[PDB]
Design an enzyme around this catalytic site. Sequence first.
Site, PDB file in Angstrom:
ATOM      1  N   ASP A  36     -30.989  37.690  15.054  1.00 13.09           N
ATOM      2  CA  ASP A  36     -29.777  36.891  14.838  1.00 13.09           C
ATOM      3  C   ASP A  36     -29.968  35.394  15.111  1.00 13.09           C
ATOM      4  O   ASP A  36     -29.899  34.938  16.259  1.00 13.09           O
ATOM      5  CB  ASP A  36     -28.644  37.481  15.715  1.00 13.09           C
ATOM      6  CG  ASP A  36     -27.302  36.787  15.509  1.00 13.09           C
ATOM      7  OD1 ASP A  36     -27.153  36.069  14.517  1.00 13.09           O
ATOM      8  OD2 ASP A  36     -26.396  36.977  16.335  1.00 13.09           O
ATOM      9  N   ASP A 232     -27.875  31.550   9.293  1.00 12.53           N
ATOM     10  CA  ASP A 232     -27.558  32.682  10.169  1.00 12.53           C
ATOM     11  C   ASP A 232     -27.964  34.039   9.609  1.00 12.53           C
ATOM     12  O   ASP A 232     -27.254  34.624   8.768  1.00 12.53           O
ATOM     13  CB  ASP A 232     -26.048  32.681  10.445  1.00 12.53           C
ATOM     14  CG  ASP A 232     -25.600  33.823  11.370  1.00 12.53           C
ATOM     15  OD1 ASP A 232     -26.458  34.459  11.983  1.00 12.53           O
ATOM     16  OD2 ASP A 232     -24.393  34.069  11.481  1.00 12.53           O
TER      17      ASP A 232
END
Length: 390
Positions: A36, A232
């Site tokens: 992440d 992201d």
Amino acid sequence: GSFVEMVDNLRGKSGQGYYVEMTVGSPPQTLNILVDTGSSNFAVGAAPHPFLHRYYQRQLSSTYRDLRKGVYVPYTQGKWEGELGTDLVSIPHGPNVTVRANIAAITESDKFFINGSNWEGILGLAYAEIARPDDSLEPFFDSLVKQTHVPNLFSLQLCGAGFPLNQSEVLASVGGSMIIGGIDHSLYTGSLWYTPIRREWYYEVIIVRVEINGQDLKMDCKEYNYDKSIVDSGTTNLRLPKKVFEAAVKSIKAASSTEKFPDGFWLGEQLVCWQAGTTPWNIFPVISLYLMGEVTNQSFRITILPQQYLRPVEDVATSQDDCYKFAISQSSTGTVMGAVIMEGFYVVFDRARKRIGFAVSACHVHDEFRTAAVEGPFVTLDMEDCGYNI
Ligand SMILES: CCC[C@H]1CN(Cc2ccc(CN3C(=N)N[C@](CCC4CCCCC4)(CC4CCCCC4)C3=O)cc2)C(=O)N1
């Protein structure tokens, strides 16, 4: 390719996340962990949950250290809460080092774990500024770099299959590579082009121009980065600020106008299907995002295909049709270059030089007529003005 030990160490898909195997504790406890780049905490399930078939058991680790402090992390559509501590952590298919890192042992969560994703925790790779509870909780990558000789850089090649993978297939398929401490040249074609990391919190960048099949969206460029633009891997879609999303969708609809799609498709909620092998890729436009370059008044562009922004999904009737969901959606928190965009490129997070590199991915999905691209340079003026300030 000079990092063979780390090539092909990821598994997963855009809709549920890409993960890497890690070990925590002594003796080592193996867990699959979501990569992440949109957060900065290393947090792992540490108590039973309907969607986990394993979790971190602190009482079984001789090297576990309790920090005697809780952490509460609410986010958009859910939250996770846990207890902070440290332990020895390694990445089996990574650098051959072991480091002592902070670990948030998740004891309660809501809409965090995903049924069938095969991961049991998350690895927040962004900067301390957005770590919870505060920036004093050193992120994993910071610890890794401080404790070893691993260079302050990592790179990601997320590989979308281009079609649906069933449960068995997604568990057996290679989903990409996370190269820790370097760049592997076998993972991309052409040249790498770099954009500055605007500020070190999220991996923030500045978009200076947007085109749909070469046609300029022509908006004030600050709109493209309102209120920020980030990379992201934890987000599935390419998310765009409301006004930009509305303009982009209008242009994408116009380019693909020879076929009419229901409003639900454009809202990213319903799938559209075509007879096997007949997806009309050619009627959908390519999308180019121009990013600020490292040289004054210079930019470069990354171009993706509908093979990136149409996400393969299984038909409700498990038929033989090829189906997809539109993976571009609106945001009220800025642009998010999610996994479906990252699938087109090899992305280098060069923390040491405060820049992010992009090159065409060796595993991007395309057809015989078009390919993703990373091209430059282009003369672009007043790019600093494209950045938004509160
Ligand atoms: C993996 C694919 C899942 C689905 C869900 N889904 C919507 C969605 C909405 C927002 C975000 C942004 N985001 C993120 N990157 N990490 C967190 C913490 C941010 C962090 C920032 C600093 C402050 C504290 C919180 C936690 C997530 C990480 C992914 C698993 C769930 C929790 C977060 O909210 C990501 C995904 C999506 O698109 N595909």
